[PDB]
Ligand binder design. Structure first.
Ligand SMILES: [Cl-]
Length: 114
């Protein structure tokens, strides 16, 4: 998978905003959300999210569902390093275990489970 946020912003600029957010906004998690390729869902205009660390993955599912006009009756899976996070996990625990060298957390969503 290729991320549009990396194709539009190099590491030096991504890292700079990451160091910036991590210092000035310590209780916030910089998350990059992008649709996985070969998926038939709606694409999100807003890719950069500044969610609080107390926010849970279940709550993040709800926020993303409202922006693609998807109902709970539809399939929606989050992937981080090809691993589906649990709903109880906080976005802060996701960041600590899964953030990249640019200090951003990358989440992909799809309608498939693979
Ligand atoms: Cl954006």
């Amino acid at each position: 998978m290729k991320w549009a946020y990396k194709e539009e912003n190099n590491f030096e600029k991504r890292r700079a905003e990451g160091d910036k957010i991590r210092r000035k906004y310590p209780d916030r998690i910089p998350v990059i959300v992008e649709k996985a390729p070969k998926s038939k869902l709606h694409d999100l205009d807003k890719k950069k999210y500044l969610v609080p660390s107390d926010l849970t993955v279940g709550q993040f599912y709800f926020l993303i569902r409202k922006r693609i006009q998807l109902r709970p009756e539809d399939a929606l899976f989050f992937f981080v390093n090809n691993v589906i996070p649990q709903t109880m996990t906080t976005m802060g625990q996701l960041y600590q275990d899964h953030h990249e060298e640019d200090l951003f957390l990358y989440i992909a969503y799809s309608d498939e489970s693979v």
